[PDB]
Each structure stands twice: as C-alpha cells, then as structure tokens.
Design a protein around this ligand. Structure first.
Ligand SMILES: O=C(O)CNC(=O)C(=O)O
Ligand SMILES: [Co+2]
Length: 228
C-alpha cells in the first residue's frame, strides 16, 4: 500500500505516530525549498565537484573515477552499463555542496549527536537498483533530482525475505524484489509491503532496520541522513 504523505507534521506527531512505532512516512513541505532543489543540475555538479574522486558501483564491480568521468561515462548519452555513485559522503568531501542541504529538524528527536549523522549522496542514471536490505539507523532519504520507486518491508517480515547467511551480508535479502524466484523463495510472495514513488522535494522516513529496495526511474540524486 502507499506510504502516507504528511505536510510539515509537528515534531511530537512525527515522534508518536512514526518514529516510536517505526512506521514509514513521506514528509512534504520540509526539504522542498532547500537550495539543492533549484541549484543542482549536471552542470552545477560538474562545476563544483567535477574534479573530485568518487567511488562508483558498476553493474558487478567497484571502481574510482572523477565526478566528471562518472557523468561522461555513466550519465550522458548512451552509457555501456549502469553505474552508480552510491553511498558516498560527498558533503564531507565537498563542504561547499553541504551548504545546499541541512539536517532535518526531526533528527533532534533522536538520542544521537548531530555531528555523528552520516550524510550520503546517491547519484546515478535511470535504472540504478539498490537490492533489498536494512540499515542499522533511522534514515531520512531526501529526493533532489528525478524519481525513485521504493518498496518497504517491515522488520517483522524478515522470515519471508531470505537474508544472506553470512554476518557480512545478513542485512541483505537474497531476493530480487521485482522478479523474485518464487520456486526458491516461496515465502516472499505473501509478505506485505509499502511502496511509493519518491519525487523531488520529498523526504522518505525509513525507520531503523526497515527493509528497503530502491530503483531510480529517471536521472536521480538523493541525499540520505542516517541518524539515531
Ligand atoms: O537510494 C538508493 O538507491 C538506496 N538508498 C539507501 O539504501 C539508503 O538511503 O539507505
Ligand atoms: Co539503505
């Protein structure tokens, strides 16, 4: 079913109805006028960040190249393969860019310290896929450019998601959400979920340990805030 959308909810309403019970929600009217929303474009990103080295996930492999090279090879025209500048602390690397975002006020409801919040960039073409997995902190995923299809499964449903059987990968599902092998993973079919298309200016709250799967529908840039 669709993730609820709420316009600028109070801190206490967000706390009581979403944060404490661990329920996803999309926050509207919160990040929609951050400077990134109007400023970020391929040209702006090239100008500010083009010469800097970033990690890129290809396919599968992991490599390093400049932001300019990433755009040239994996974003524009007709890329050979899907590449994704995923899960990278770009704003620590480039303080000028950090000026264009801010910490959501709702993070103050956490028990953690503000300067321990991990801020990651997720920048890539249409068609990037982050397979179903769970993270160990709360997340506000802020959509800046393009749209993402997102599927969410509660931690209560872990038994239907067939986690990998190693410590390193136990927070990742073995299932391909959008084309599941139901002969091998029959329990997956029945597991309930939420989904949404997250659009520019919207923030998705992904509760701590909620399983999430993410596919970019367009050229996309998201910023995640991992907080406690
Ligand atoms: O945006 C993506 O492709 C995936 N994002 C996450 O898993 C996250 O923000 O924790
Ligand atoms: Co994640």
């Amino acid at each position: 079913s669709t993730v609820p959308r709420l316009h600028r909810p109070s801190l206490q309403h967000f706390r009581e109805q979403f944060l404490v019970p661990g329920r996803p929600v999309i926050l509207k009217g919160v990040a929609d006028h951050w400077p990134c929303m109007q400023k970020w474009s391929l040209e702006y990103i090239q100008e500010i960040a083009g010469c800097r080295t970033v990690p890129v996930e290809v396919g599968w492999s992991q490599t390093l190249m400049t932001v300019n090279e990433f755009i040239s090879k994996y974003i524009v025209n007709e890329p050979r393969d899907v590449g994704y500048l995923a899960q990278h602390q770009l704003f620590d690397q480039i303080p000028e860019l950090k000026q264009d975002i801010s910490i959501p006020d709702y993070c103050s409801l956490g028990d953690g310290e503000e300067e321990e919040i991990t801020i990651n960039a997720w920048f890539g073409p249409q068609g990037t896929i982050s397979p179903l997995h769970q993270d160990p902190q709360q997340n506000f995923l802020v959509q800046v450019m393009g749209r993402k299809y997102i599927r969410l499964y509660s931690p209560q449903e872990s038994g239907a998601l067939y986690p990998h059987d190693t410590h390193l990968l136990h927070n990742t599902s073995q299932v391909d959400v959008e084309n599941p092998d139901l002969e091998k993973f029959p329990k997956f079919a029945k597991a309930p979920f939420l989904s949404c298309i997250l659009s520019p200016g919207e923030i998705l709250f992904i509760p701590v340990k909620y399983w999430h799967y993410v596919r970019a529908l367009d050229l996309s840039f998201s910023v995640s805030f991992w907080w406690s």
